[PDB]
Design a protein around this ligand. Structure first.
Ligand SMILES: O=C(COc1ccc(Cl)cc1Cl)Nc1ccc(CN2CCCCC2)cc1
Ligand SMILES: O=C(COc1ccc(Cl)cc1Cl)Nc1ccc(CN2CCCCC2)cc1
Ligand SMILES: *[C@@H]1O[C@H](CO)[C@@H](O)[C@H](O)[C@H]1NC(C)=O
Ligand SMILES: *[C@@H]1O[C@H](CO)[C@@H](O)[C@H](O)[C@H]1NC(C)=O
Ligand SMILES: *[C@@H]1O[C@H](CO)[C@@H](O)[C@H](O)[C@H]1NC(C)=O
Lengths: 533, 535
C-alpha cells in the first residue's frame, strides 16, 4: 500500500489517492473533515473542531457540496453549468482538500489556500476550474481548498443573538486555516508561509481575513481576484441582515431564540426557495445572505477598516478581468441575453442603471447615466450595451479594487495589481461579454496544460506564466521571477504612480491609473452625493 | 463744398456728412466716423431708451472717432500693451452714441453686403474705435461695407429697476437696435445693401448678437449672425429682474440714494461716481462676472435666453459660432490668487480649490466639489502645471465653450444652419505669457485682417491666414455659407448638426473637421449641473 498516500494528522490517519497530471503524478487528499457536521441544532452556529476518528479515513474523493441555490437560467449550457454543484448537496459539507507533489515535498513548501466565490450564496471546492493538481505538479506547490457554508446556512444572522450571530461561513474558512496551521506540515507544507487566494466572494473573504485580527496569525500573504471586502455587495449592516432574516422567517412560516428555533426545523430546500425574495430592491450583483458588520468578526465596516488599518508588514496581489460586469446583465437587465448581441436602446440603458445601481437615488442614477453615455454617440446601441456592462463592473469590482489597492498602498502594504485581458478560446458565452467575471481562474490553476481540454498552445504557455507569477508571489510576496532578467518587471502599485500590468498573450505591459477618472467619480463623488442629495 | 473730394460727401436721414479717405495696404477706403445716431443720452436721459438723433444742419465732419461711452478703465497692468489695447482710446463721455462706416473707395456701384460689428467687454467696457476693430481691411480687401456702433455700457447701459419707467434696463441693447435701424434706413447711401446685413461680435458683443436673434423687434434688422466666444445663454450674460433691482439699489445706496426718487437721485450723480462703485455690487467674489448686464425684463427678453433658445423657431436662421482654444486663461489674473502674467502661474491644489469657488461663484459646495472632481487629473492630482491649466479650463468651459456648445446644439436641432469653429492660432505678436495659450479676444485681430498691415510685424503665414479668415466671414455674410463656391479643392466647412457635431479648426494649417464640441465635459456643465442645482 502506497506510503505516500498515507498521512497522519491530529485527528487520525488519512488515505489519499495518486492522481495524474500531464507532467507526472500528484498526491491528492480529498474530503478531509475539518469540522463537526453543522447540522440540526448546529445550523447557523459557528463551526466546531472535528472529533478524532479511528482507523484510516478514506480521503480519495470530493465530499458533498454545501447546501445552496442552483442556477437555472440556461439549463444544460456549459457556460452556466460549470459553476453549479458537481457533487450531492448537503449541510454536512465541512471538508477541505489538499494537493501536493508526489512524492510529497522533501522540504517544507509554501502553501496556497484557495477560497471560492459564488456571491456567498453558492460555490464548491470540487469544481473542475479549482483543480489543484496542475499547480502542485508544475510549481511543486501545496494547494488547499475548503468548503464553507453559503447562503442562509453560512450567513443568516440575527445580530446579537447567541444562536445566529452571523458570519459563520467565514468562521468555517477560519477553522480550515487553523487546520492548515496544525496539520499541513504533515503533508510537507510550510505553515509559516501561507498564501490565501480567492475570486469574487472568495476574494472578498480573503479581504475580510485581512481585516479580522484573529485570522491574521493564520496567513502571510493574500491574493484578491475580482473582489473586495469593501464595496456595495460584500457586507451588510446588522440592521439590514436582521431585516432579511426575519423576512425569510416570515416567508417560511416563522424573541430571537424562538425565531431561530423554528428556522432550524425547516428542510434545507425550503430556506433556499426564498433566498432571492428578501432583497430590498430589484438588482443584479446583489446577494441576500453575506457577511455582516457584527462588530465582532468585523469590528467596523470594511470601508472604515481599510481607511484606518495598519498594513505595514503585508503583501497583496489584486486585479480584475477586462469585463467585470458583462456576465451579470443577463441575470436581470431587460434586453440582455447570451443568445443575441444584446443591442439596447437608451431607454433600456436608463432602466438598466436602476438595477445595476439599486441603492442609487434618482439624482445619483442620473449622474451615472450622464457619466457613461458617450455624448458623441448617445444613442448608439453598441456603446449603450458596453456602457451598461461597464457600469456594473466598475461599481461592483473595478473601483472597489482601486479603492482597496490605494488604501493598502498608502498604509504600508506591498501591492501588485493587474488587469486580465485574455479571453479563453473555449469560452461558450457570446463575444459581446468579452472577458467575463471569473474566466481568469482556469488559467491561474493551469487547466490549459491538459491537452484534452482543447486550449491553444499559446494559452498553455500563458497559463504557465500565470502559475509562475502566482506561486512566485506565494514564495516571496513578489510575483517576479527571481533569476530572470528582462521582462520587463511587474512593478508594485503605489499611490504616486499607480502602476499595474496587463496579463495577456503578449509580454507584461505596465500601465498607470486603474480607471482613475471614473473611479474618482465612484469613490469620491457619489458618496458625497447620496450623503446629502 | 467745391474743392472737397466728391467721393467723400454723402447725405443720410439726419443731414450731410463729410468722410475721410483712408490708406489701407492695398489701396484707399472711405471712412465715415462719428456719425451720431441718437440724441445724447445725457442729463434727464441717463438710463433712458435712446431717442433717434434729430436732423442737423450743414455738413457734419465725420472724419474722426467720437467719444467712448463712460466706463471703468482697467488698471491691472499699467502701461502693458496686453491690457492697454482694450482701454478707451478717445475721451470718455455720456455723449457717445455714434457709429462708424467703412466702404470701398470709390463707393460700391452695386449694393454690397453689410457687416455690423458689436464690441465686447463684459457689458461694462468697450469701444467701436479700438485698433483691432479697424474696418479698413475688410472694406478694401473684401469690398465689405462695415459698420460699428458705440452703445452704452455699465450702469448707463444696463442699470435697471425692472418695471419702472425711468430705468427699464437693457437700454444699451436698445442703442444697438437703433444703430441697426439706422443701417436699414441710411446704408444704401453708402452703397450698402440693407437687405443683406450680417451681425458679428465677440464676448459680450456675441451675447448681444444672440439677444437680437432672441428679440423679435431686432429680427427684421438682420439676416445672418456670427457669435465669437460669447452667447446670450450662460452664467454671465444676463441677470433676473430680482438680481438687477438688487444690484441697482445697492449702487444707489453706495452713492447715497419709490423708484422715481431713487432714479432721479442717481441722475444727479457725476458719471465717475457711478463707475467707481461698479465692481462693489457683485454678490460673490468672482471672475467672469459683470455688475450691469442685460436683464430678463419680459420685454426685450420675453423670457430667459435658455428658455428662448430651447423652444424657439430658427428655421430660417444662419449662424456662425466659435471659440478660441483657451477661453479662460485671461480671466484668471483678474481675481484667482496664484495667477500672474509675470510668472508661469504654477499653482497648488489648495489654490485650485479656492480658484474654483471664484471661477464658479454661483456653485454650492457640492457643485464645486463636482467641478473639482471632474477637472482633477487623478494620476497627477497635485501637479501644478495640470492644475493651472485645469483652472483655466474650468473658467473657459463654464463661461464660453459650453454655453456655445449648448447654443449650437439647440439652434441646429431647431432648424438653424450653424457653422462652428475653434480658433487655435496664437499671434506671433501676443504680449501675454505662453501659459495663456490662445486667450479670449485674440482671434479678432485676424478676422479684421490686421496682419495685412506690414508695420504690425506679423508673419507672412499670418498674413495669408488672416486673408483666409476674412474670406470665410465675408463669404458667410454674402451667402450664409463660409465656403467658397469657386474653390472645391480646399477642404469644406460642413454645418454643425446634432447627429454629427462637426466643427473646424482655424489655424495655420488647412481646415480640419472635428467632432463633438467638448461633448463629454459640456454634458457635465449642461445636463448634470442644472439637475444638481435642482436639489
Ligand atoms: O449573480 C447571479 C444572479 O443570481 C440569481 C438571482 C435571482 C434568481 Cl431568481 C436566480 C439567480 Cl441564479 N448569478 C451568477 C453570477 C455569476 C456566476 C459566475 N461566477 C460564479 C462563482 C465564481 C465566479 C464566476 C454564476 C451565477
Ligand atoms: O474680466 C475682467 C475683470 O475686470 C475687473 C474686475 C475688478 C476690478 Cl477691481 C477691476 C477690473 Cl479691470 N477684465 C477683463 C477681461 C477681458 C479683457 C479683454 N476682452 C475685452 C473685450 C474684448 C475681448 C477681450 C479685458 C479686461
Ligand atoms: C435578445 O434576446 C432576448 C431573449 O430571447 C430578448 O428578450 C431581447 O429582446 C433580444 N434583444 C434584441 C436586441 O433583439
Ligand atoms: C506669480 O507672481 C505674482 C506677483 O509677482 C504672485 O502674487 C503669484 O503668487 C505668483 N504665482 C506663482 C505660482 O508663483
Ligand atoms: C516692427 O519691427 C521693427 C524692426 O525691429 C521695429 O523697429 C518696430 O518697432 C516693430 N513694430 C512693432 C509695432 O512692434
Amino acid at each position: 500500500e502506497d506510503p505516500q498516500l498515507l498521512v497522519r494528522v491530529r485527528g487520525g490517519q488519512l488515505r489519499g489517492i495518486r492522481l495524474k497530471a500531464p507532467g507526472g503524478p500528484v498526491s491528492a487528499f480529498l474530503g478531509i473533515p475539518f469540522a463537526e457536521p453543522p447540522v440540526g441544532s448546529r445550523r447557523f452556529m459557528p463551526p466546531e473542531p472535528k472529533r478524532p476518528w479511528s482507523g484510516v479515513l478514506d480521503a480519495t474523493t470530493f465530499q458533498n457540496v454545501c447546501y445552496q441555490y442552483v442556477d437555472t437560467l440556461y439549463p444544460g449550457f456549459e457556460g452556466t453549468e460549470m459553476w453549479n454543484p458537481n457533487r450531492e448537496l448537503s449541510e454536512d459539507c465541512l471538508y477541505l482538500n489538499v494537493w501536493t507533489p508526489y512524492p510529497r515535498p522533501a522540504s517544507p513548501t509554501p502553501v496556497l489556500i484557495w477560497i471560492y466565490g459564488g456571491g456567498f450564496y453558492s460555490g464548491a471546492a470540487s469544481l473542475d476550474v479549482y483543480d489543484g493538481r496542475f499547480l502542485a505538479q508544475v510549481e511543486g506547490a501545496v494547494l488547499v481548498s475548503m468548503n464553507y457554508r453559503v447562503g442562509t446556512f453560512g450567513f443568516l444572522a440575527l445580530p446579537g443573538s447567541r444562536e445566529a450571530p452571523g458570519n459563520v461561513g467565514l468562521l468555517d474558512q477560519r477553522l480550515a486555516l487553523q487546520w492548515v496551521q496544525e496539520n499541513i506540515a504533515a503533508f510537507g507544507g510550510d505553515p509559516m508561509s501561507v498564501t490565501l487566494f480567492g475570486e469574487s466572494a472568495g476574494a472578498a473573504s480573503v479581504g475580510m481575513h485581512i481585516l479580522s485580527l484573529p485570522s491574521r496569525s493564520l496567513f502571510h500573504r493574500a491574493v484578491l481576484q475580482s473582489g473586495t471586502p469593501n464595496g456595495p455587495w460584500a457586507t451588510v449592516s446588522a440592521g439590514e441582515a436582521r431585516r432579511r432574516a426575519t423576512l425569510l422567517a416570515r416567508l417560511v412560516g416563522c424573541n430571537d431564540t424562538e425565531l431561530i428555533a423554528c428556522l432550524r426545523t425547516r428542510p434545507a430546500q425550503d430556506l433556499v426557495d426564498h433566498e432571492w425574495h428578501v432583497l430590498p430592491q430589484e438588482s443584479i450583483f446583489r446577494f441576500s445572505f453575506v457577511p455582516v458588520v457584527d462588530g465582532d468578526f468585523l469590528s467596523d465596516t470594511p470601508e472604515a477598516l481599510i481607511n484606518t488599518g495598519d498594513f505595514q508588514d503585508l503583501q497583496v496581489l489584486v486585479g480584475v478581468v477586462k469585463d467585470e460586469g458583462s456576465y451579470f446583465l443577463v441575470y436581470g437587465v431587460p434586453g440582455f441575453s447570451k443568445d443575441n448581441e444584446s443591442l439596447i436602446s437608451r431607454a433600456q440603458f436608463l432602466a438598466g442603471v436602476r438595477i445595476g445601481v439599486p441603492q442609487a437615488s434618482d439624482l445619483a442614477a442620473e449622474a451615472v447615466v450622464l457619466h457613461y453615455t458617450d455624448w458623441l454617440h448617445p444613442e448608439d446601441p453598441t456603446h449603450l450595451r458596453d456602457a451598461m456592462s461597464a457600469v456594473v463592473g466598475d461599481h461592483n469590482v473595478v473601483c472597489p479594487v482601486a479603492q482597496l489597492a490605494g488604501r493598502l498602498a498608502a498604509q504600508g502594504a506591498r501591492v501588485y495589481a493587474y488587469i486580465f485581458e485574455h479571453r479563453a478560446s473555449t469560452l461558450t458565452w457570446p463575444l459581446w461579454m468579452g472577458v467575463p467575471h471569473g474566466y481568469e481562474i482556469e488559467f491561474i490553476f493551469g487547466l490549459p496544460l491538459d491537452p484534452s481540454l482543447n486550449y491553444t498552445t499559446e494559452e498553455r504557455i500563458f497559463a504557465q506564466r500565470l502559475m509562475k507569477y502566482w506561486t512566485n508571489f506565494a514564495r516571496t510576496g513578489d510575483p517576479n521571477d527571481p533569476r530572470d532578467s528582462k521582462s520587463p518587471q511587474w512593478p508594485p502599485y503605489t499611490t504616486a504612480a499607480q502602476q499595474y500590468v496587463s496579463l495577456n498573450l503578449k509580454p507584461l505591459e505596465v500601465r498607470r491609473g486603474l480607471r482613475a477618472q471614473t473611479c474618482a467619480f465612484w469613490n469620491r463623488f457619489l458618496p458625497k452625493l447620496l450623503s446629502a442629495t
